[PDB]
Amino acid sequence: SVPAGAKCRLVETLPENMDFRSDHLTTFECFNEIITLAKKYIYIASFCCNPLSTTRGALIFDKLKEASEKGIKIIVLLDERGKRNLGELQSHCPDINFITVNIDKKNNVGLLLGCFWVSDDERCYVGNASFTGGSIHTIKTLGVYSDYPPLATDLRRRFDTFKAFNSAKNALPVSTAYHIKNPIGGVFFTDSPEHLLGYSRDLDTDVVIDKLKSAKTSIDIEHLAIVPTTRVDGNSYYWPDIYNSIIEAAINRGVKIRLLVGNWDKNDVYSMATARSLDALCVQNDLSVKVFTIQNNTKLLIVDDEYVHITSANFDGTHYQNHGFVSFNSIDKQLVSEAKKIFERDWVSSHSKSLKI
Amino acid sequence: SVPAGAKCRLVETLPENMDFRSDHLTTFECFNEIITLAKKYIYIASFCCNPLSTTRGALIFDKLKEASEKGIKIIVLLDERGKRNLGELQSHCPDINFITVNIDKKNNVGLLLGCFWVSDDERCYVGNASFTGGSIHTIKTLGVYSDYPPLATDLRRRFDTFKAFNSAKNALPVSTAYHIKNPIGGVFFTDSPEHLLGYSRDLDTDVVIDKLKSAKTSIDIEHLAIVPTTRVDGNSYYWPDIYNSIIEAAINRGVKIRLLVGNWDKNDVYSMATARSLDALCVQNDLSVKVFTIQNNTKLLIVDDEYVHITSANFDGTHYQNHGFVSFNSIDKQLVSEAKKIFERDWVSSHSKSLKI
Numbered sequence A, B: 001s002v003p004a005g006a007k008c009r010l011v012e013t014l015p016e017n018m019d020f021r022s023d024h025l026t027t028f029e030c031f032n033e034i035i036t037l038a039k040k041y042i043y044i045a046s047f048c049c050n051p052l053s054t055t056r057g058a059l060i061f062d063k064l065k066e067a068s069e070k071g072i073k074i075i076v077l078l079d080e081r082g083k084r085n086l087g088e089l090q091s092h093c094p095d096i097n098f099i100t101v102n103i104d105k106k107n108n109v110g111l112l113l114g115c116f117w118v119s120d121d122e123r124c125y126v127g128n129a130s131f132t133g134g135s136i137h138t139i140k141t142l143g144v145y146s147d148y149p150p151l152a153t154d155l156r157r158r159f160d161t162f163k164a165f166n167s168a169k170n171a172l173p174v175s176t177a178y179h180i181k182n183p184i185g186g187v188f189f190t191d192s193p194e195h196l197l198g199y200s201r202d203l204d205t206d207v208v209i210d211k212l213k214s215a216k217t218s219i220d221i222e223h224l225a226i227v228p229t230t231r232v233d234g235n236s237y238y239w240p241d242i243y244n245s246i247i248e249a250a251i252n253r254g255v256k257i258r259l260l261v262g263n264w265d266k267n268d269v270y271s272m273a274t275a276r277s278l279d280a281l282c283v284q285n286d287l288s289v290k291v292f293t294i295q296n297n298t299k300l301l302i303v304d305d306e307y308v309h310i311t312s313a314n315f316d317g318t319h320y321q322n323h324g325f326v327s328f329n330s331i332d333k334q335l336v337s338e339a340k341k342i343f344e345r346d347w348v349s350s351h352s353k354s355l356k357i
């Protein structure tokens, strides 16, 4: 049979200078386990690659260096804008193959996110902890680890999609085995963007909005910002698709929504008006907003204590229209309950003060 | 052949205590002309009916009283909530047939607006000047008069739709002759709501949003409010469909938009957040907002100096989802240019101060 939850367990980074405590697997322990149990390959993908920035990030880079010398095919995908440290990486690991990826060469807007590991088509990690020393040591992250072969194999097919966009000289099946119409143990992957989706994969933009509109009781979102206007290039881009489905739940359906976003800029007139209007919604409706100032890459979504959505991208226009990433989705009640515990901890954390304007 | 503009001319009410001046036909002159030239019937429809509130409104009620005594079938449609003056009306005009209409007996939300006259299938008026003494004398209104038989006949078919919903005891073809796909002289009627639209008529909600998204240069709107949340019954109703298409034009397409809305309530947390965010958009984009405090029923929309939309309803959720009304639409360059002159006059009027918060 198929195990419930697809052998998935929560993984996150809790720095020492932060009051976050949990019994889940740490990101440092997760990456070290993938390298130790590696017998065939290690495929890593993220935007920026800079493990040598912290102590724990350098140890993971050393275990990965020893793996490539033992005969393990290690491929690291990184967007061509995180190419600043490329000369530093190849000088330390001549065996690890580093590949610069530009998924959007037509307009140069789409960035490579992804943020996932996969090894031997058995073990894998999916979260917002990039291959940087910060995400492993000093920055709060969140993700899921799974040693289930059928699930990690479906994630490796996502790696084959992004690998084809290497910036070198000159067929892609865009294959998937599980989606919202056929999950594996109550777990499936949503993908992005739409022009790289193919015909079988599920667009993460549609799946998130569908779960936001199908909400019945609670909506818990811990992202960096929900400001529906993000500045692409040097101009403003208005995209309230996710921002509307949330307020539609709080006003029309009376959903108790708690948003934990990062602190906004005092000079950004766009983030100012977004915040002052969320302040007015907390008075009339059951909306609650708290802000944080720490370095946190967590992108969490929980609906009705029944569905969970952990991703590396942020709920905004720039990400869900151009950026390419893989998002974790699960409806397993036992796995969602563990994610609910994480949001309750962060909501009352000392680093989460109530929104004041 | 067919005349350009479909024999349409602008009609409005400019009270003496207001600095509004124009050479167009007045509403008092318009209603008096329809009654004088009446030879068969006079069909009137509006929400509230109270002509005896002002002097000019009483004169129109006297000319209409003399018409019913001369042998003219006069039918007055009014929503069952404007029924307070019904006993006062029938006591003064026993020949005029007054009919109470409730277009929404399932949920009791949809109100009868319409706000139009039609006589002999030749002359007609379409605007926001209800059959009240205020709309004729003391309240600024706006509308269009046309003695073109093919156009007034298409408006009378709208009267046959609302007349069928009389609250008395117990087939409706919902016929139309002209729409956006087949205008008459560059003029057509959009209708509302959707459950009374039939299969041939055009929903005003779709036509307005289509013209708002197809804007290329300018958007001029003079309505009562653009607050995307209106309180139905005793609860809040979130509906940003029109509010999104406007901001999508100003931010994504850089459309110079000038909104002339009424003053908002200091205690309405919903209108407060709506205003403070329009204030932030005027700083970054080319948006301009001015507010008025006078009694004004004008509902005007001008796009690219090429399309005009005069209606009796307001751009909000309660109206374009339940209320039943008929809206005037025209693409005639000569008629739109005259409407542009009206908006420019109102934008710099003494009753239109810049939005301040």
Ligand SMILES: Cc1ccc(NS(=O)(=O)c2c(C(=O)N3CCCCCC3)c(C)n(C)c2C)c(Cl)c1
Pocket: A227, A228, A229, A240, A243, A244, A247, A269, A270, A271, A273, A274, A277, A278, A280, A281, B228, B229, B240, B243, B244, B247, B270, B273, B274, B277, B278, B280
């Ligand atoms: C960057 C930026 C700049 C301005 C705004 N403006 S806005 O007022 O905050 C707003 C809201 C909004 O939150 N309210 C709250 C109060 C009542 C419910 C309607 C209005 C919505 C739903 N939309 C579609 C907009 C545009 C925004 Cl959202 C973002």
